[PDB]
Amino acid sequence: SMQEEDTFRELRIFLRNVTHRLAIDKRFRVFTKPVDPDEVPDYVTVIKQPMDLSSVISKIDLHKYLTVKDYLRDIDLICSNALEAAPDRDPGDRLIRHRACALRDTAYAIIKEELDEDFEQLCEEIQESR
Numbered sequence: 001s002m003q004e005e006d007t008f009r010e011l012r013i014f015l016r017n018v019t020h021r022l023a024i025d026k027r028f029r030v031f032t033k034p035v036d037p038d039e040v041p042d043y044v045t046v047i048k049q050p051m052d053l054s055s056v057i058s059k060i061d062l063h064k065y066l067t068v069k070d071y072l073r074d075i076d077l078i079c080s081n082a083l084e085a086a087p088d089r090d091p092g093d094r095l096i097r098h099r100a101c102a103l104r105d106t107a108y109a110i111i112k113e114e115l116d117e118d119f120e121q122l123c124e125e126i127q128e129s130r
């Protein structure tokens, strides 16, 4: 229905807002774009499912997220990919992991504070009905 399409529209607007807020945070700059094949060629081999905040925006616009849970799966993937790609004790890797963890925590905290759980439940029930 149009009411359901309106709901999905509201979700995309909200998701777009949260993602923007993430993407402008200077700590999260390394997560804003795909990793560069030239800068390191082993990334595409070691990371099977690359994800970044620009790809998240593209997916919102392609109507790929019908629930907040589906969006958070991609935020989690950005984080888990970073942890896997930067696992060592050296300061460079620890900085990346710290920032990855902060990205995840920030997204979750924004969502906890700003998303009505009944809105999410509605999204889930429309998704399940299709």
Ligand SMILES: [Cl-]
Residues within 6 Å of the ligand: none
């Ligand atoms: Cl830096």
